[PDB]
Point group: D2
Chain length 266, copies 4
Amino acid sequence: EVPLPQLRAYTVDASWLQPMAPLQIADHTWQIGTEDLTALLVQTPDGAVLLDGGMPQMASHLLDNMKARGVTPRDLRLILLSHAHADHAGPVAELKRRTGAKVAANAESAVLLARGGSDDLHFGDGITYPPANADRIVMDGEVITVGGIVFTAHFMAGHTPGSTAWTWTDTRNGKPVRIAYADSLSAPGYQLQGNPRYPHLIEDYRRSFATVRALPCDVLLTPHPGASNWDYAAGARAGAKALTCKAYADAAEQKFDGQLAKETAG
Amino acid sequence: EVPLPQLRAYTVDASWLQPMAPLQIADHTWQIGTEDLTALLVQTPDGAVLLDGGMPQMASHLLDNMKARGVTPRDLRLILLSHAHADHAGPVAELKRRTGAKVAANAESAVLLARGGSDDLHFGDGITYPPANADRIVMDGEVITVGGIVFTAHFMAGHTPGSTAWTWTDTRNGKPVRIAYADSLSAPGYQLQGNPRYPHLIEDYRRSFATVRALPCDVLLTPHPGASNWDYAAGARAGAKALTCKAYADAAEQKFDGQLAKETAG
Amino acid sequence: EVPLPQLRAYTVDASWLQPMAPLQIADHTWQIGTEDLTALLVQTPDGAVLLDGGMPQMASHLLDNMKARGVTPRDLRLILLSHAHADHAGPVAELKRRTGAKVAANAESAVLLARGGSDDLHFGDGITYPPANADRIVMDGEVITVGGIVFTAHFMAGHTPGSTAWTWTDTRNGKPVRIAYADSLSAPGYQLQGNPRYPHLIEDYRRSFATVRALPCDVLLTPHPGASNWDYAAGARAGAKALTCKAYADAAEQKFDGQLAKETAG
Amino acid sequence: EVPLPQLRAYTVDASWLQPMAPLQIADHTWQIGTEDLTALLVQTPDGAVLLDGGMPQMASHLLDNMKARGVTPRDLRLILLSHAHADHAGPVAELKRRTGAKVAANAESAVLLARGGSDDLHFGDGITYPPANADRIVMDGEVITVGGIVFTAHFMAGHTPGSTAWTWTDTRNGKPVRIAYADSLSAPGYQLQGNPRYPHLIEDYRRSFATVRALPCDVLLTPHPGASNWDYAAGARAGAKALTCKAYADAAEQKFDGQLAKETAG
Ligand SMILES: Cc1ccccc1-c1n[nH]c(=S)n1N
Ligand SMILES: Cc1ccccc1-c1n[nH]c(=S)n1N
Ligand SMILES: Cc1ccccc1-c1n[nH]c(=S)n1N
Ligand SMILES: Cc1ccccc1-c1n[nH]c(=S)n1N
Ligand SMILES: Cc1ccccc1-c1n[nH]c(=S)n1N
Ligand SMILES: Cc1ccccc1-c1n[nH]c(=S)n1N
Ligand SMILES: Cc1ccccc1-c1n[nH]c(=S)n1N
Ligand SMILES: Cc1ccccc1-c1n[nH]c(=S)n1N
Ligand SMILES: [Zn+2]
Ligand SMILES: [Zn+2]
Ligand SMILES: [Zn+2]
Ligand SMILES: [Zn+2]
Ligand SMILES: [Zn+2]
Ligand SMILES: [Zn+2]
Ligand SMILES: [Zn+2]
Ligand SMILES: [Zn+2]
């Protein structure tokens, strides 16, 4: 007799789980996640902002890197997200319990986060994580300000309905640097055409390619560094090979077109 | 010495609160709300669907009209919404407690409904109602089926971010009738330009005019009958003067353009 | 023809809405609410705690009093509640939006707060307010610490299922002062016996009288000052006539017994 | 270099996941879960009630057994729970999506269910499952009626704060059978004494032993059949060796006392 299968945890490449010390991107902005998952710490005179947390098991590591940067749990004011999947919003619930952080997200990301990634449009309950509540809902183009640093939401629906690019201007060498943190434009295993759970998926991705193309973008960062050709293990050269937002959008669209063609052929 | 003001309940025109008997729109579809607030009952071989409930005090009236139509509380399967303001989603929480009904809504409508209309983009906490949870989140263009009757969501963001037109095909006289239930395209007291809580408000309304224009639309109904020139008190002539979806969209756009011009002048 | 009634806002005595300047209770502890609604500010080296906010319209007043005390919105860390009715938790949602404050509450209070007081066991939807989410759920006897000040939850179910007394030790004149903030032990218009929504109501109130009787209680404060014979308008004599926790419990039990007898007679 | 550990799914004994055909307990009441996880189907003239669903992967199996019993997804009206851990409430979110079922639970169980078992008092995020919302909150002693069958909640806090025994009277052989579905009285790996997350844990378990002892209890069933000495694989003898509620309470208290002694020694 054959029992129902055991639950299976989603495993990821070791590099996604490999702790790294803080890597400075600009005067206020640091990568504090792992070798292969972005978690951006933005430090202001009025507390700190975290953009993404990576996987659920990264909470303690994030807190240790924050401490190394001089940010105590009380000092973390705000959490923003690229998208509410387990490998980017994984530790958000735990971070909220263990810090002063509140979450701002769009309605789509808030709904997905509140169900801990369950009933995903494409993944079903395959990739779940601890649910968290949003403290503020943002609209497309809306800004949120912490310690005078202004972050602008740019909705880029597709990878998830609530996928968002976040933009802000930091400084380096006395010069402004317009940083764009663009969400994933992957569609891993997705049914793209005629998907009853996402009927306008293709139109949304197309619009999102155009949105990403047009971001204020002196420097592009992505939830997976490899997407934008960052190499967080490469020290002084970490960002040397980084794509422009234009090239990232184009490469993602080319890949998407290929996937659409293969799906039609499939 | 001057105390803080007493809370003020939102009052509405008496007609919005004036009970009426069920008014048949098509073979399966009945208006069961008040003279001036739409609440559509769609009766299927597998239970009933309610589109909108009107104001919070209308729950019992709705249930009485459902009973008159042969729909017991157990038989009400689904609640859909035009938008999650007090004068359309008012009694939803109570209906869920008192019937078998589950709610399907988009993420924006779900978020607003779950906070009972509080922290509204334009109204603040001026117009609140009992919060309710959504049971199913729908995407733009997604269909939901009850007793073989298929309802399609058409997102028409503006009046609220989650404003939705619902379409379905009923029958009359052996002929199909493509019914369009289009949400409000009003912007009552709204700041339209440069609204920090809704930066792309104008672009969303413009897109929504185009969406409404293009709906499958043999018969248009609206949350306020007057918006589409229905007169639910007019018996056999209730729907005679009804606007097409095209004319409704055009009139709403003309009004919107006027409001934009007056705002610029203001 | 007779329309459904207009919604009616709950009105309260003017004194409940009458702003007052901060009134010091102990070295760290201030009354910052109105003449007749308690809102306790506890100021620590690590940010401030608010116990209750009063009615929904009191948010701005609370924030102004906090500013007068040197507590900026960022500095408000924690909100605790006596019970989640409109006249004590009214402004909590707004305070969370406008400050750094997170909410800790028991599961019963959290559920009631999340529905904005709707579907109340006794009031139905008569007394609703903007819903808010809890950030931390506490158990009976659990402590929560802010800036070294330790607050202990004592569950005293009855007035609401989640009614809580909060205790902490402050100082005055170099001496410890064990402060007890005991919730209401009223049952206004309640059906006490055989209430299908609260079958063990009487047993819970009885247990709660015993809990209140036994609190560490050098100084008793209550959500309505009059309950404990505080007079916040009386300056240096505000707390002179204050009841012990023992006397408060006894008077409340005597009143309850009377109500039970009258209900039996009714 | 050493990456953070991969997430680990909780595995269970194969028997907990071993599908079985429906096993009749009384005229209306069937075991439809697995060999070693209880899921009780109660069939009424007005739809069906499910008490527990077992593990997250059991949804489809439950639905298949319901179909075999003549209960279509539309016909499932109500889900009740012993406690909101993954091995009993696992499939509840999915069941709600796939059926007409609404959930009734106490505030503690509702809060835990809504966070999908995350931030557990004892397990932390070790044992999570898809979150679900409750549709009705019940108080201790409150009854809920479906198709004339009356279910009474008896709170028995300890295993979880919201642990509940459910009682109802079915029939067998023309005679009433008072069925008691008592929750777990285990404390697996729990810190019992001086637990900051559950300060009154011991007092709650003691009270719960007394509650279980005193249930109306012609037949005891438990979430794990072995707890009450049921053997669902034993056909006509499945319930022969079943403990009384009195013996179950006593054995659980004896085990608890042993655990307390070992903890003190530890
Ligand atoms: C596809 C996948 C498998 C396991 C864990 C996470 C994911 C995932 N969701 N979104 C992105 S980007 N992923 N890598
Ligand atoms: C005060 C509080 C309640 C719930 C969750 C988190 C917190 C909190 N605020 N600041 C810090 S550090 N916390 N842990
Ligand atoms: C503007 C207003 C006042 C009171 C009650 C409801 C409303 C309202 N919100 N959306 C629409 S359409 N309304 N009439
Ligand atoms: C069973 C149930 C639980 C919570 C809320 C509503 C209901 C319900 N289902 N069918 C009917 S009629 N109900 N009242
Ligand atoms: C009874 C009542 C009427 C209006 C507003 C609030 C209340 C109330 N709930 N709990 C307490 S204490 N109140 N005064
Ligand atoms: C950052 C944030 C997000 C949502 C709600 C409130 C807040 C906040 N934290 N500190 C202050 S002051 N806020 N307004
Ligand atoms: C202890 C444990 C491990 C894995 C899955 C479930 C559980 C559990 N929680 N409550 C009960 S009873 N369990 N068996
Ligand atoms: C209508 C509905 C919406 C959300 C979730 C479930 C359902 C539902 N009701 N009856 C059946 S069968 N459903 N799947
Ligand atoms: Zn993803
Ligand atoms: Zn990813
Ligand atoms: Zn509206
Ligand atoms: Zn309206
Ligand atoms: Zn009250
Ligand atoms: Zn009060
Ligand atoms: Zn358990
Ligand atoms: Zn178990």
